Amino acid sequence: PFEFVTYSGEESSPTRTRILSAALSPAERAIFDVPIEKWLSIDRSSLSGWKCAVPRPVTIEQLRPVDPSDAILRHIALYRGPVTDLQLDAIVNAANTRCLGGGGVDGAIHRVAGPLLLRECATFNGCQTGECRLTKGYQLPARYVLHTVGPVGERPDMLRKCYRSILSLALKNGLRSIGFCCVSTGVYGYPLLPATRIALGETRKFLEEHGGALDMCCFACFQEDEYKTYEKCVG
Protein backbone atom coordinates (compact mmCIF):
# COMPACT_ATOMS: atom_id res chain seq x y z
CA PRO A 1 0.00 0.00 0.00
CA PHE A 2 2.96 2.49 0.52
CA GLU A 3 6.19 3.32 -1.30
CA PHE A 4 9.03 3.04 1.28
CA VAL A 5 11.01 6.13 2.19
CA THR A 6 14.62 4.98 1.58
CA TYR A 7 16.64 8.12 2.37
CA SER A 8 16.14 10.48 5.30
CA GLY A 9 17.69 13.48 3.46
CA GLU A 10 17.45 15.24 0.08
CA GLU A 11 19.63 14.07 -2.85
CA SER A 12 33.58 7.51 -7.91
CA SER A 13 30.55 7.11 -10.24
CA PRO A 14 32.98 5.01 -12.38
CA THR A 15 33.24 2.63 -9.37
CA ARG A 16 29.42 2.60 -9.11
CA THR A 17 29.27 1.86 -12.84
CA ARG A 18 31.80 -0.99 -12.49
CA ILE A 19 29.93 -2.50 -9.51
CA LEU A 20 26.63 -2.35 -11.44
CA SER A 21 28.15 -3.76 -14.67
CA ALA A 22 29.18 -7.05 -12.93
CA ALA A 23 27.20 -10.12 -14.05
CA LEU A 24 24.52 -11.72 -11.87
CA SER A 25 23.20 -15.25 -11.91
CA PRO A 26 19.43 -15.39 -12.74
CA ALA A 27 18.80 -16.47 -9.14
CA GLU A 28 20.81 -13.51 -7.70
CA ARG A 29 19.04 -11.15 -10.15
CA ALA A 30 15.63 -12.35 -8.87
CA ILE A 31 16.63 -11.47 -5.25
CA PHE A 32 17.97 -8.10 -6.29
CA ASP A 33 14.73 -7.33 -8.17
CA VAL A 34 12.37 -8.00 -5.21
CA PRO A 35 10.69 -4.64 -4.52
CA ILE A 36 12.13 -3.13 -1.32
CA GLU A 37 8.65 -3.04 0.37
CA LYS A 38 8.06 -6.76 -0.13
CA TRP A 39 11.32 -7.87 1.51
CA LEU A 40 10.05 -7.33 5.07
CA SER A 41 7.48 -10.16 4.89
CA ILE A 42 8.55 -12.27 1.90
CA ASP A 43 9.47 -15.90 2.61
CA ARG A 44 13.18 -15.52 1.72
CA SER A 45 13.70 -19.30 1.49
CA SER A 46 11.23 -19.30 -1.47
CA LEU A 47 13.99 -17.66 -3.55
CA SER A 48 16.40 -20.35 -4.80
CA GLY A 49 19.35 -17.87 -4.76
CA TRP A 50 18.97 -16.97 -1.07
CA LYS A 51 20.45 -18.35 2.13
CA CYS A 52 21.04 -16.94 5.56
CA ALA A 53 24.84 -16.57 6.06
CA VAL A 54 24.60 -16.63 9.91
CA PRO A 55 24.22 -20.23 11.18
CA ARG A 56 22.52 -19.38 14.52
CA PRO A 57 20.72 -16.04 14.29
CA VAL A 58 19.66 -14.27 17.51
CA THR A 59 15.86 -13.65 17.53
CA ILE A 60 13.83 -11.03 19.51
CA GLU A 61 12.68 -13.85 21.84
CA GLN A 62 16.32 -14.62 22.82
CA LEU A 63 17.22 -11.01 23.75
CA ARG A 64 17.01 -9.98 27.42
CA PRO A 65 15.31 -6.61 27.78
CA VAL A 66 16.99 -4.23 30.21
CA ASP A 67 13.84 -4.13 32.42
CA PRO A 68 10.51 -5.88 31.57
CA SER A 69 8.62 -3.75 34.19
CA ASP A 70 9.50 -0.42 32.61
CA ALA A 71 7.43 1.09 29.78
CA ILE A 72 10.67 2.16 28.00
CA LEU A 73 13.35 -0.31 29.08
CA ARG A 74 11.26 -3.36 28.15
CA HIS A 75 11.95 -2.24 24.56
CA ILE A 76 15.79 -2.02 24.99
CA ALA A 77 18.31 -4.83 25.10
CA LEU A 78 22.10 -5.10 24.94
CA TYR A 79 23.78 -7.87 22.93
CA ARG A 80 27.34 -9.12 23.51
CA GLY A 81 28.21 -9.74 19.90
CA PRO A 82 28.17 -8.47 16.35
CA VAL A 83 25.09 -6.62 15.01
CA THR A 84 25.02 -9.03 12.03
CA ASP A 85 23.82 -11.90 14.28
CA LEU A 86 20.52 -10.11 15.02
CA GLN A 87 17.36 -11.33 13.27
CA LEU A 88 15.42 -8.06 13.49
CA ASP A 89 13.62 -5.92 10.95
CA ALA A 90 16.72 -3.74 10.47
CA ILE A 91 20.37 -3.39 11.55
CA VAL A 92 22.40 -0.24 11.45
CA ASN A 93 25.57 0.02 9.38
CA ALA A 94 28.09 2.72 10.39
CA ALA A 95 29.05 3.74 6.87
CA ASN A 96 31.15 6.45 5.36
CA THR A 97 29.99 9.17 2.96
CA ARG A 98 30.69 7.04 -0.18
CA CYS A 99 28.56 4.25 1.31
CA LEU A 100 30.30 1.43 -0.66
CA GLY A 101 31.72 -0.75 2.10
CA GLY A 102 34.94 -0.37 4.08
CA GLY A 103 36.60 -1.64 7.29
CA GLY A 104 35.24 -2.72 10.68
CA VAL A 105 31.45 -3.14 11.09
CA ASP A 106 30.88 -1.71 7.55
CA GLY A 107 33.13 -4.49 6.11
CA ALA A 108 31.70 -7.36 8.17
CA ILE A 109 28.08 -6.36 7.26
CA HIS A 110 29.13 -6.60 3.58
CA ARG A 111 30.76 -10.01 4.04
CA VAL A 112 27.74 -11.57 5.77
CA ALA A 113 25.12 -9.94 3.49
CA GLY A 114 26.92 -10.94 0.31
CA PRO A 115 27.76 -8.95 -2.80
CA LEU A 116 24.18 -7.75 -3.51
CA LEU A 117 24.39 -5.29 -0.58
CA LEU A 118 27.23 -3.48 -2.28
CA ARG A 119 25.33 -3.55 -5.58
CA GLU A 120 22.25 -1.93 -4.02
CA CYS A 121 24.50 0.72 -2.41
CA ALA A 122 25.88 1.42 -5.90
CA THR A 123 22.35 2.40 -7.10
CA PHE A 124 22.38 5.67 -5.13
CA ASN A 125 24.87 8.51 -4.67
CA GLY A 126 26.34 7.98 -1.21
CA CYS A 127 24.90 9.18 2.09
CA GLN A 128 25.33 12.61 3.71
CA THR A 129 26.57 12.93 7.28
CA GLY A 130 23.58 12.84 9.63
CA GLU A 131 21.41 10.94 7.12
CA CYS A 132 20.37 7.33 6.63
CA ARG A 133 19.95 5.03 3.57
CA LEU A 134 17.70 1.95 3.64
CA THR A 135 18.55 -1.21 1.68
CA LYS A 136 17.55 -4.85 1.69
CA GLY A 137 19.72 -7.03 3.94
CA TYR A 138 20.15 -9.99 1.51
CA GLN A 139 21.94 -12.84 3.35
CA LEU A 140 21.74 -11.21 6.79
CA PRO A 141 19.14 -12.65 9.15
CA ALA A 142 17.88 -9.07 9.51
CA ARG A 143 15.60 -7.82 6.74
CA TYR A 144 17.05 -4.40 6.05
CA VAL A 145 20.14 -2.37 6.61
CA LEU A 146 20.02 1.23 7.75
CA HIS A 147 23.26 2.81 6.49
CA THR A 148 24.14 5.93 8.50
CA VAL A 149 27.08 8.33 8.24
CA GLY A 150 28.18 9.58 11.65
CA PRO A 151 30.36 12.66 12.20
CA VAL A 152 34.15 12.63 12.60
CA GLY A 153 35.04 13.84 16.15
CA GLU A 154 32.71 15.09 18.90
CA ARG A 155 29.83 16.81 17.05
CA PRO A 156 26.72 16.19 19.18
CA ASP A 157 23.91 17.62 17.01
CA MET A 158 25.23 15.57 14.06
CA LEU A 159 25.39 12.35 16.00
CA ARG A 160 21.86 12.97 17.42
CA LYS A 161 20.75 13.57 13.83
CA CYS A 162 21.98 10.04 12.86
CA TYR A 163 19.90 8.37 15.52
CA ARG A 164 16.90 10.51 14.51
CA SER A 165 17.28 9.65 10.80
CA ILE A 166 17.48 5.96 11.60
CA LEU A 167 14.48 5.85 13.98
CA SER A 168 12.44 8.13 11.67
CA LEU A 169 12.93 5.79 8.66
CA ALA A 170 12.07 2.81 10.80
CA LEU A 171 8.74 4.41 11.93
CA LYS A 172 7.72 5.62 8.47
CA ASN A 173 8.27 2.18 6.91
CA GLY A 174 6.97 -0.01 9.75
CA LEU A 175 10.32 -1.46 10.87
CA ARG A 176 9.53 -2.58 14.43
CA SER A 177 12.91 -3.81 15.67
CA ILE A 178 16.38 -2.27 15.16
CA GLY A 179 19.90 -3.57 15.92
CA PHE A 180 22.32 -0.70 16.59
CA CYS A 181 26.14 -0.66 16.43
CA CYS A 182 28.25 2.17 18.04
CA VAL A 183 28.20 5.00 15.47
CA SER A 184 31.26 7.39 15.21
CA THR A 185 33.23 5.74 18.05
CA GLY A 186 36.69 4.18 17.58
CA VAL A 187 38.37 5.52 14.43
CA TYR A 188 35.96 8.47 13.81
CA GLY A 189 36.93 9.53 17.37
CA TYR A 190 33.63 10.35 19.14
CA PRO A 191 34.35 9.47 22.75
CA LEU A 192 32.54 6.33 23.78
CA LEU A 193 30.54 7.48 26.81
CA PRO A 194 29.18 10.70 25.35
CA ALA A 195 28.25 8.79 22.12
CA THR A 196 26.45 6.15 24.16
CA ARG A 197 24.42 8.76 26.06
CA ILE A 198 23.29 10.28 22.74
CA ALA A 199 22.29 6.82 21.41
CA LEU A 200 20.32 5.85 24.54
CA GLY A 201 18.85 9.32 24.96
CA GLU A 202 17.49 9.57 21.42
CA THR A 203 16.19 6.05 21.53
CA ARG A 204 14.36 6.74 24.84
CA LYS A 205 12.89 9.88 23.24
CA PHE A 206 11.44 7.85 20.38
CA LEU A 207 10.13 5.12 22.67
CA GLU A 208 8.29 7.77 24.77
CA GLU A 209 6.61 9.45 21.78
CA HIS A 210 5.91 6.28 19.67
CA GLY A 211 5.21 3.39 22.07
CA GLY A 212 3.17 1.09 19.83
CA ALA A 213 5.47 1.29 16.76
CA LEU A 214 8.79 -0.06 18.18
CA ASP A 215 9.05 -3.49 19.82
CA MET A 216 12.85 -3.65 20.33
CA CYS A 217 15.94 -1.45 20.02
CA CYS A 218 18.97 -3.74 20.53
CA PHE A 219 22.45 -2.30 21.11
CA ALA A 220 25.01 -4.75 19.81
CA CYS A 221 28.31 -4.18 21.61
CA PHE A 222 30.96 -6.29 19.91
CA GLN A 223 33.77 -4.91 22.14
CA GLU A 224 34.06 -5.18 25.96
CA ASP A 225 34.41 -1.43 26.61
CA GLU A 226 31.29 -0.76 24.50
CA TYR A 227 29.27 -3.34 26.44
CA LYS A 228 30.33 -2.11 29.89
CA THR A 229 29.68 1.53 28.98
CA TYR A 230 26.12 0.70 27.71
CA GLU A 231 25.48 -1.57 30.72
CA LYS A 232 26.40 1.16 33.19
CA CYS A 233 24.31 3.81 31.35
CA VAL A 234 21.02 1.80 31.15
CA GLY A 235 20.89 0.45 34.73
Author numbering: 11 to 21, 38 to 261
The authors write:
We named these proteins as Trypanosoma brucei MacroD-like protein (TbMDO) and Trypanosoma cruzi MacroD-like protein (TcMDO). We show that the trypanosomatid MacroD1/MacroD2 homologues are hydrolyzing both protein-linked ADP-ribose and free O-acetyl-ADP-ribose. The macrodomain fold (starting from residues 99 and 92 in TbMDO and TcMDO, respectively) is well-conserved between the human MacroD proteins and consists of a central mostly parallel six-stranded β-sheet surrounded by five α-helices. Active site of the macrodomains is located at the C-terminal edge of the β-sheet and is lined by N-terminal ends of four α-helices.
Crystal structures of TbMDO were determined to 1.95 Å and 1.2 Å resolution (for crystal form 1 and 2, respectively) and crystal structure of TcMDO to 2.0 Å resolution. The two crystal forms of TbMDO are almost identical with RMSD of 0.4 Å. Structures of TbMDO and TcMDO comprise residues from 11–261 and 13–257, respectively and share a highly conserved structure (RMSD 0.84 Å). While the N-terminus of the TbMDO folds back to the core and extends the β-sheet, the N-terminus of the TcMDO packs to the precisely same site but in the neighboring molecule in the crystal. When comparing the ADP-ribose bound structure to apo-TbMDO, it is evident that the binding site for ADP-ribose in TbMDO is preformed. Upon binding of ADP-ribose, eight water molecules (and a glycerol molecule) are displaced but no large conformational changes in coordinating residues are observed.
